[PDB]
Amino acid sequence: SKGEELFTGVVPILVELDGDVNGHKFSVSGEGEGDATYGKLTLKFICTTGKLPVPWPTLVTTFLQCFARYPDHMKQHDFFKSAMPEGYVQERTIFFKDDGNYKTRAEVKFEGDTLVNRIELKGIDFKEDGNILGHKLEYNYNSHNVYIMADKQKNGIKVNFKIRHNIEDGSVQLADHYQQNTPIGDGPVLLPDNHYLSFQSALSKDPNEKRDHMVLLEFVTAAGITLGM
């Protein structure tokens, strides 16, 4: 498989995001690598414009589903790799329960031998001292399942999941994610049976880094389709 073949080894990654949340504008640059064979991504992010005006964990899902590890019997349900190298557009609305929303548009494609995630993010109607603008979120992440189905009407997929952000007082801030992906190229892509991606993530810091930043590790494996009865 052409697409699949581009992910057999370790692949360098670059991430660029330009954001505006409630009028606070910022930019983040990220870099690292992904290894689809093991379903593993390792990335470091730096806010190039100063202090990040929202908590790092709220941007984790925005900052590479093409690095999921698909079991063999599921490999023909991997839309993400099938769209490469031309790439795909990933769009979302994320509703923070009882708070504002993020809307994102991103292009994920190969630029030379590097896989590049380029993002625009706009956020509105956040409360000045809610969990997001008030920075009340713990610096950590939980595991979640990301549900995928075909969207034939658009030659792409529709994706949904619900993120739990732990809050420093023992409560949880929910973030309801709605996502669609469509290929950038005209070539045939694989449209999948219903299935999900199992995510686990861990956030940490670079002790030598002067800038506001995030080190992120993700492990992603596809599941939900069985071999046999």
Coordinates of C-alpha atoms in Angstrom, one line a residue:
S1 CA 0.0 0.0 0.0
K2 CA 1.4 3.4 -1.1
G3 CA 0.1 5.3 1.9
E4 CA 0.7 2.6 4.5
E5 CA 4.3 2.3 3.2
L6 CA 5.2 5.8 4.2
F7 CA 4.7 4.9 7.9
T8 CA 6.8 1.6 8.3
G9 CA 9.6 3.5 10.0
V10 CA 10.1 6.5 12.3
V11 CA 8.7 9.6 10.7
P12 CA 9.8 13.2 11.7
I13 CA 6.9 15.5 12.6
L14 CA 6.4 19.3 12.6
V15 CA 3.4 21.1 14.1
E16 CA 2.4 24.7 13.7
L17 CA -0.6 26.3 15.3
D18 CA -2.0 29.8 15.1
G19 CA -4.7 30.5 17.6
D20 CA -7.1 33.2 19.0
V21 CA -9.1 32.4 22.1
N22 CA -11.4 35.2 23.2
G23 CA -9.1 37.7 21.4
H24 CA -5.9 36.4 23.0
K25 CA -3.8 35.5 20.0
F26 CA -0.9 33.1 20.2
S27 CA 1.3 30.7 18.2
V28 CA 2.8 27.3 19.0
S29 CA 5.5 25.4 17.2
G30 CA 6.0 21.7 17.8
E31 CA 8.4 18.9 16.7
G32 CA 9.2 15.3 17.3
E33 CA 8.5 12.0 15.5
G34 CA 5.9 9.2 15.2
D35 CA 6.2 5.5 14.9
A36 CA 3.0 3.9 13.5
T37 CA 4.4 0.4 13.9
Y38 CA 4.2 0.8 17.7
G39 CA 1.5 3.5 17.6
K40 CA 3.7 6.0 19.4
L41 CA 4.2 9.8 19.0
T42 CA 6.7 12.0 20.9
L43 CA 6.4 15.7 20.6
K44 CA 7.6 18.9 22.2
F45 CA 5.6 22.2 21.9
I46 CA 6.8 25.8 22.5
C47 CA 4.6 28.9 22.7
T48 CA 6.6 31.3 20.5
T49 CA 4.5 34.4 21.5
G50 CA 5.0 34.3 25.2
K51 CA 2.7 32.7 27.8
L52 CA 0.1 30.3 26.4
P53 CA -3.3 31.9 27.2
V54 CA -5.1 28.6 27.7
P55 CA -4.0 25.5 29.6
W56 CA -1.7 23.1 27.6
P57 CA -3.9 20.1 28.1
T58 CA -6.8 21.8 26.2
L59 CA -4.7 21.8 23.0
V60 CA -3.5 18.2 23.2
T61 CA -6.1 16.8 20.9
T62 CA -5.5 19.6 18.4
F63 CA -1.7 19.1 18.3
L64 CA -1.9 13.0 14.3
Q65 CA -4.2 10.1 14.0
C66 CA -2.2 8.7 11.0
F67 CA 0.3 7.3 13.6
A68 CA -2.3 5.0 15.1
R69 CA -1.2 1.3 15.0
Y70 CA -3.8 -0.7 13.1
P71 CA -3.8 -4.4 13.7
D72 CA -3.3 -6.4 10.4
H73 CA -7.0 -7.4 10.0
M74 CA -8.0 -3.7 10.4
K75 CA -5.4 -2.2 8.0
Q76 CA -8.0 -1.6 5.3
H77 CA -9.9 0.6 7.6
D78 CA -7.1 3.1 8.1
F79 CA -8.4 6.2 6.4
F80 CA -5.6 8.4 7.7
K81 CA -2.7 6.6 6.0
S82 CA -4.7 6.0 2.9
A83 CA -4.9 9.7 2.3
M84 CA -1.1 10.2 2.4
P85 CA 1.1 11.6 1.1
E86 CA -1.4 14.3 -0.2
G87 CA -2.8 14.4 3.3
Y88 CA -6.2 15.2 4.8
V89 CA -8.0 18.2 6.4
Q90 CA -9.0 17.6 10.0
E91 CA -11.8 19.9 11.4
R92 CA -13.3 20.1 14.8
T93 CA -15.7 21.9 17.1
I94 CA -14.8 21.2 20.7
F95 CA -17.5 22.2 23.3
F96 CA -16.2 22.7 26.8
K97 CA -19.1 21.9 29.0
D98 CA -20.5 25.1 30.6
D99 CA -17.8 27.2 28.8
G100 CA -16.7 28.3 25.4
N101 CA -15.8 26.3 22.3
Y102 CA -12.7 25.8 20.1
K103 CA -13.1 25.5 16.3
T104 CA -10.1 24.1 14.4
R105 CA -9.0 23.5 10.9
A106 CA -5.9 21.6 10.2
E107 CA -4.0 20.1 7.3
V108 CA -1.9 17.0 7.8
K109 CA 0.3 16.1 4.9
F110 CA 3.8 15.1 4.0
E111 CA 6.1 18.0 3.2
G112 CA 9.2 16.2 1.9
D113 CA 9.9 13.5 4.3
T114 CA 8.3 15.2 7.3
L115 CA 4.7 14.9 8.3
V116 CA 3.4 18.4 9.0
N117 CA 0.3 19.3 11.0
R118 CA -0.7 22.9 10.3
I119 CA -3.5 24.4 12.4
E120 CA -5.8 27.3 12.8
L121 CA -7.7 27.6 16.0
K122 CA -10.4 30.0 17.1
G123 CA -12.0 30.0 20.5
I124 CA -14.9 32.1 21.7
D125 CA -17.3 32.6 24.6
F126 CA -15.0 31.4 27.3
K127 CA -15.6 32.6 30.9
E128 CA -12.9 35.0 32.2
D129 CA -12.5 32.8 35.3
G130 CA -13.8 29.5 34.1
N131 CA -11.6 26.4 34.1
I132 CA -9.9 27.3 30.8
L133 CA -9.1 31.0 30.9
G134 CA -8.7 30.7 34.7
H135 CA -6.1 27.9 34.2
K136 CA -7.7 25.5 36.7
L137 CA -6.8 22.3 34.8
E138 CA -4.3 19.8 36.2
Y139 CA -1.2 19.3 33.9
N140 CA -2.0 15.7 33.0
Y141 CA -4.1 13.6 30.6
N142 CA -6.4 10.5 30.8
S143 CA -7.1 7.7 28.3
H144 CA -10.0 8.0 25.8
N145 CA -11.6 6.2 22.8
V146 CA -12.0 8.1 19.6
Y147 CA -14.9 6.8 17.5
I148 CA -14.7 6.7 13.7
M149 CA -17.3 6.0 11.0
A150 CA -17.5 6.6 7.3
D151 CA -19.0 9.9 6.0
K152 CA -19.7 8.8 2.4
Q153 CA -21.5 12.1 1.6
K154 CA -18.1 13.8 1.9
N155 CA -15.6 11.0 0.9
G156 CA -14.2 11.2 4.4
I157 CA -14.9 10.2 8.0
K158 CA -16.8 11.6 11.0
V159 CA -15.1 11.2 14.5
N160 CA -16.4 11.9 18.0
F161 CA -15.2 11.5 21.5
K162 CA -15.4 13.1 24.9
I163 CA -12.3 14.3 26.8
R164 CA -12.1 14.5 30.6
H165 CA -9.8 17.2 31.9
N166 CA -9.0 16.7 35.6
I167 CA -9.4 19.9 37.7
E168 CA -7.3 20.8 40.6
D169 CA -10.3 20.5 43.0
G170 CA -11.2 16.9 42.1
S171 CA -14.0 17.9 39.6
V172 CA -13.7 17.2 35.8
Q173 CA -14.0 19.6 32.9
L174 CA -15.6 17.8 29.9
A175 CA -14.7 18.7 26.4
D176 CA -17.0 17.2 23.7
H177 CA -15.2 16.7 20.4
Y178 CA -16.8 16.6 16.9
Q179 CA -14.4 16.0 14.1
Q180 CA -14.5 15.4 10.3
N181 CA -11.6 14.5 7.9
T182 CA -11.6 14.7 4.2
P183 CA -8.7 13.9 1.8
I184 CA -6.8 16.8 0.2
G185 CA -6.0 14.7 -2.9
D186 CA -8.3 13.2 -5.5
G187 CA -6.9 9.7 -5.1
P188 CA -8.9 6.8 -3.7
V189 CA -9.0 6.7 0.1
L190 CA -10.2 3.9 2.4
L191 CA -13.5 4.4 4.0
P192 CA -13.7 2.4 7.2
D193 CA -16.2 0.2 9.0
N194 CA -17.1 1.6 12.4
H195 CA -14.2 1.3 14.9
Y196 CA -12.2 3.4 17.4
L197 CA -8.7 4.4 18.3
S198 CA -7.6 3.9 21.9
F199 CA -5.5 6.9 23.1
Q200 CA -3.3 7.2 26.2
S201 CA -1.2 10.3 26.8
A202 CA 1.3 11.7 29.3
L203 CA 2.4 15.3 29.6
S204 CA 5.7 16.5 31.0
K205 CA 8.2 19.3 31.0
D206 CA 11.7 19.9 29.7
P207 CA 13.7 21.0 32.8
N208 CA 16.1 23.0 30.6
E209 CA 13.4 24.8 28.6
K210 CA 13.0 28.6 29.4
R211 CA 9.8 29.0 27.3
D212 CA 6.3 28.0 28.2
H213 CA 6.1 24.5 26.7
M214 CA 4.7 21.0 26.7
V215 CA 6.3 17.6 26.2
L216 CA 3.7 15.1 25.0
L217 CA 3.7 11.3 24.6
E218 CA 0.8 9.5 22.9
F219 CA 0.2 5.8 22.4
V220 CA -2.6 5.0 19.9
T221 CA -3.9 1.7 18.8
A222 CA -7.0 0.9 16.6
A223 CA -9.6 -1.5 17.9
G224 CA -13.3 -2.4 17.7
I225 CA -13.3 -4.8 14.8
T226 CA -12.9 -8.5 15.6
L227 CA -11.1 -11.3 13.8
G228 CA -13.5 -14.2 13.9
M229 CA -16.6 -14.8 16.0

